[PDB]
A paper describes a structure:
Our structural analysis shows that ARS2 is made up of two regions, residues 147–270 and 408–763 that co-fold into a structured core with an intervening glutamate-rich region of unknown function that is likely unstructured. We find that the RRM domain is required to bind RNA, whereas a basic patch in the C-terminal leg of ARS2 mediates the interaction with FLASH.
Here, we describe the crystal structure of the folded core of human ARS2 corresponding to residues 147–270 and 408–763, which are separated by a large unstructured region. We set out to determine the crystal structure of human ARS2 and first worked with the construct ARS2147–763, thus excluding the N- and C-terminal tails predicted to be unstructured. Since crystals of ARS2147–763 only diffracted to around 20 Å resolution, and disorder predictions suggested the presence of an additional central, low-complexity region, limited proteolysis was used to delineate the structured domains. The structure of ARS2147–270+408–763 was solved using selenomethionine-labelled protein and the single-isomorphous replacement with anomalous-scattering (SIRAS) method. In all crystal structures of hARS2 (except that with loop B deleted), only the first part of the loop is observed with 570-AEEEELL forming helix α10 (‘EEEE helix’). Remarkably, all crystal forms containing loop B, irrespective of space-group, exhibit the same intermolecular crystal contact, in which the acidic ‘EEEE helix’ and the preceding short β-strand pack into the positively charged cradle formed by the RRM β-sheet and the C-terminal extension of the RRM. To accommodate the same intermolecular contact in different crystal-packing environments, some angular flexibility of the loop B structure is required.
Author numbering:
A (entry chain C): 413 to 537, 550 to 576, 599 to 762
B (entry chain A): 149 to 269
Write the structure that this text describes.
Amino acid sequence: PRPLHKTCSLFMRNIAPNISRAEIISLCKRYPGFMRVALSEPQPERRFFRRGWVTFDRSVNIKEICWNLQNIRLRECELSPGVNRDLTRRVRNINGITQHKQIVRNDIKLAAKLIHTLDDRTQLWLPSQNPILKNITDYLIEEVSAEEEELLERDEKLIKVLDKLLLYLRIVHSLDYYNTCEYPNEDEMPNRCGIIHVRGPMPPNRISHGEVLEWQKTFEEKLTPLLSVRESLSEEEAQKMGRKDPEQEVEKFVTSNTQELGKDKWLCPLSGKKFKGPEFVRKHIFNKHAEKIEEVKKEVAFFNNFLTDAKRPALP
Amino acid sequence: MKTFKEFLLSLDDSVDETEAVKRYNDYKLDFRRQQMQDFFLAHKDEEWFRSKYHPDEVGKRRQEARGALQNRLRVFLSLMETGWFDNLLLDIDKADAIVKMLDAAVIKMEGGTENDLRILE
């Protein structure tokens, strides 16, 4: 039997942005029992410097391997790794008010929407054709023969229903519900399912009439960030800020390549071949060098994609 | 960038209220145009920035994500039909079950058989 749930790991502060995964992988690949590397978001306050986690098989020791990398550099910066210890407090507490009839029902409404959004957004599975959304919606019902009669605090039914949604949200989509946060990189990180937040012990007092509504307004206001789409600017503001047209800037590539050496004698520096007019050089670049015309279109779209985003990376 | 106080102070000839607010709002965009063109060329070939915005790399990360996610689904769907959260509630009373269940999930995420899970018993 294997202990695959355990994996010891290194941690590296202040990795450069010019450093890629590929070259960190190759640095750690020739060690035995190497598994995977996981880099975090580059923070703008530290000049977009990343934070890395190199994960190893739990059999092979970490303290020697941390020493063997202790004064090593990559690209143009020195790593100085440290041993990443295991997670202490996994199953964490929140408010005990969350185990309530009205609150669990709303938690099920929210958890449904979260899955509805995330499934469609990730492109798993226009109604959602996920089984736990159909099969659970069949349940949460009263079923009585009232027609035949006419002629002649906890709710563990809803909690057991909620748990299937919450565990799906946590395990599949890495969304800690009760904390109201994702773990985006988590699948590459050392611990694949670390911290999970859980309902509290008791609510000591009588449960207040407005406090149940206040909790949901705080809770739902925190969940609304997690559903938000990438904020694209107005098609004016994108064009004003400087959206490059694809076909226009493709013409700029063709003409600037088509140079003139003399009278009815035109060269282009993408081959080294001279032609009798400006029309002959245009058909040469389109037909024979189809790779470059796409390469311009791609890097136009690359620059556009950046301008599209309103919430961009930039220096503070 | 220099603030609204400073730009108005460097124009003491054609001093109008209507013209001042227009030219500063034009200067704002004129500057922020420059910052984006600087920032694009600054972090052009870096993998983090490539991955978020470049069509070729954006396509790769989606395929990489879907494949890794579909494998995480299979784990949940295995834990359902195996019933690792058959008698399990997200409560502090049932905390030891959650930690054992998560470890059983991670082993399945890596791709270990039911024999591998025996160490948790």
